[PDB]
Amino acid sequence: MVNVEEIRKAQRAEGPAAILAIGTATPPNAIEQSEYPDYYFRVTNSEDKVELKEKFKRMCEKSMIKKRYLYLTEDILKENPNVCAYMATSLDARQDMVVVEVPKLGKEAATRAIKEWGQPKSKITHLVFCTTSGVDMPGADYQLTKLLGLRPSVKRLMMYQQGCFAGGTVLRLAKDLAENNRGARVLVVCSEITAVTFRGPSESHLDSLVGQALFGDGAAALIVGSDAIEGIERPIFEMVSAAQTILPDSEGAIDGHLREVGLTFHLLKDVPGIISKNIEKSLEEAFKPLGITDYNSLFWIAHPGGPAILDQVEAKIGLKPEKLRATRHVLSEYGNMSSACVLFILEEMRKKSAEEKNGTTGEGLEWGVLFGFGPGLTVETVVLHSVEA
Amino acid sequence: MVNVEEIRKAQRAEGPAAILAIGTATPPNAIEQSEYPDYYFRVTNSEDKVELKEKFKRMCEKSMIKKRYLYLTEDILKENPNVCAYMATSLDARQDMVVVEVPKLGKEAATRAIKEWGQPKSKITHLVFCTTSGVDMPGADYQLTKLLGLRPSVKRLMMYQQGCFAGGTVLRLAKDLAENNRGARVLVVCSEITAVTFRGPSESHLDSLVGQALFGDGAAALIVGSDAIEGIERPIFEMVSAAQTILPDSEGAIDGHLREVGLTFHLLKDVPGIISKNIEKSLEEAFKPLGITDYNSLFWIAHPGGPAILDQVEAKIGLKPEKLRATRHVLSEYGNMSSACVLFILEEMRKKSAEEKNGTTGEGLEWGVLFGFGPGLTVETVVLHSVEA
């Protein structure tokens, strides 16, 4: 009767997966980085710590961040004083905020992506939801499904407690979902809210302090699919390959623990040095098979974990000073939004390329690379193809 | 130069994903269910609550569970008295146990699966790790990678805080990973440790009490891959399709929150009734395309959330009394091991089928169905194809 070989050929999709739409959203309130050290040491009641404040001023001035959007307001902090301490029990209060706000912000981003896409919500077949802020059952994927009114039977993948590399991961995931399933349209959402990590300062833990200087909130959403319907859907970027690796002997370079005091962060040794030392190996594995050896001929998307990472990668690889313009722009305007960052950078890049009338969505270039960096020292490497503009 | 269309055709695999190996592992200590009511009310210092103890006795006697394996021993509870209270802050103590024990147990199962597979560990290209017990960064996937000595560059998917349906989810995930990537061999691990949910009894929360009667520990591992190398690798079950849906108007049927007191569980209304009312719709969606309408002609794997779910599905669908033998056997010998359960049942089924000299790994039958049930009231439905013996 029926053969699994024929079933398999019919159920799989045809060509490479493409990003068909992008949307972004942030909390309403942006705080200027120039103002943040005064603000932070005030609402954490740490004005006594003059030495520490001077270090944090340097951190914020060095961050190359102009502003960040933050769900956490002074009013919310007044209501939650255990969140303001370096270490006070506050996991429940932080969860109460984030289990609601993460899918809410994610919905805002998704609605925008779906608007650009222009297709009925009912055509979405898959949902990949990613966050590093909070956990619950059922998860944020379920909540977003309900908020948006997606079909029941949407195939969901809930990616919790992922960390900063996961912008690459959700792309790796959506690629396989879209390419292996003929009519698949994958909604991808990364939604990040720093209420789970915000805390007061400790002179014993300066690395936690740098986190307070860098992390901001935001959500990004994509529609990903193979075999775009002509005249109706329009690819923006196509995916070619997606890799992931653990950088050698980088054990506790970036750690995060979910405790009674919320999510703690540890950031040790030469994270910028570790990434810079190793990144060319990931470049070569990705591009040597394509016959590409000049990395300046690529359009670049890198997770802006901090400006020192970008600077040292640029110096190591010998990138022209403007290659990381898009990445530095979202670092400047949004700060480090963990997993969502890299997707904001894709949006920045295709918008700027259009306004500057480059020939393609990737700054006029054909091939590009997207990097996520995060705990494990994990690096995600996605090879992208631009589309003619 | 090179065209992405040809690259795509070369980089994807040919046939359907197959389970190539199965391994399981449990903590060393099993507690007889006949002894559990006395034990539990003793170590939680609740012997005063005679009324509640009799209720719990009814629960354990009704559970159709003979024993469970438990990482938590009386010695560990004595060292962690805040875990024994119904409500005491204890998340840190539970995380400390589970962030270590979950990948440790997973490694045991994985080593067993790899032994059966018989191929070098270095041939593993992907790792899907699933747990509902604890979260950390980097995750249990990173830890398992380090424990097993997998290649860096193994492509990892860390599935946290998933719940009891996730045995289905990891199959759904591994299917797309294996089928979309030509040489891919996917290590799948589900590892579940109930130290995160163990707590004392409360007459105000009887639904928490049923969890104390049902949940046990365990880990299961699979190797999944397409295009098995003939004479070297041996498919056990092949995957045909994988679906996921949210049962209508089942809102708070199964909830779990991760709080300062650990993981709390809420289990409301007629979970068995909700599942039974809706399950034929998932059967029909899965099997109508294959021309199959007699659900007794399938080999069955169902998540044993409780014996009432099994009994009511059986009655509703009109299943022969022996169809759920394999599922009921692992319920009896292991209890409810959340996401790992369904994988233990696959192992039971193919082992029993072999010892009974049935014509196939699925009790002599060609087609089968695997169900995962969990929060959202989510049901995962996987269509399986057995292999000749």
Residue numbers in the entry:
A (entry chain B), B (entry chain A): 1 to 389
Paper text:
CHS, the best studied plants-specific type III ployketide synthase, catalyses the first committed step of the branch of the phenylpropanoid pathway which leads to the synthesis of flavonoids. Enzymes of the CHS superfamily share high similarity in their amino acid sequence, structure and general catalytic principles and function as a homodimer (monomer size about 43 kDa) which contains the conserved Cys-His-Asn catalytic triad in the buried active sites. Briefly, the biosynthesis of flavonoid starts with the condensation of one molecule of p-coumaroyl-CoA (derived from the general phenylpropanoid pathway) with three molecules of malonyl-CoA, resulting in naringenin chalcone and this reaction is conducted by chalcone synthase (CHS). Furthermore, a previous study also showed that the reaction catalyzed by CHS can be seen as a three-step reaction which involves transfering the p-coumaroyl moiety to the active site residue Cys164, decarboxylation of malonyl-CoA to an acetyl-CoA carbanion and extending the polyketide intermediate.
In conclusion, we have successfully isolated FhCHS1, a CHS gene from Freesia hybrida, and examined its biological function in flavonoid biosynthesis. Multiple sequence alignments revealed that FhCHS1 shared 83.55% to 85.86% identity with AtCHS, PhCHS and MsCHS2. Consistent with previous results with other CHS proteins, the FhCHS1 protein also contained the three important catalytic residues of Cys164, His303, and Asn336 (marked with pink background) and two highly conserved Phe residues, Phe215 and Phe265 (marked with blue background), which were identified to be important for the formation of the active site as well as for the substrate specificity of the CHS. Additionally, the malonyl-CoA binding motif (marked with yellow background) and a highly conserved CHS signature sequence (marked with red background) were also found in the FhCHS1 sequence. As shown in Fig. 2B&C, the crystallographic symmetry of FhCHS1 is a dimer of dimer, with the homodimer as the biological functional unit. The individual monomer consists of roughly two domains with the active site located at the clef between the two domains and the dimerization interface, therefore sharing the accessible substrate binding area with the dimer partner. Protein sequence alignment and structure analysis indicated the strong conservation of the sequence and structure of CHS protein, and these results provided some evidence for its enzymatic function. Compared with control, the reaction product generated a new peak at a retention time (28.5 min) that matched the authentic naringenin. This indicates that FhCHS1 has a typical CHS enzymatic function, catalyzing the conversion of p-coumaroyl-CoA and malonyl-CoA substrates to naringenin chalcone.
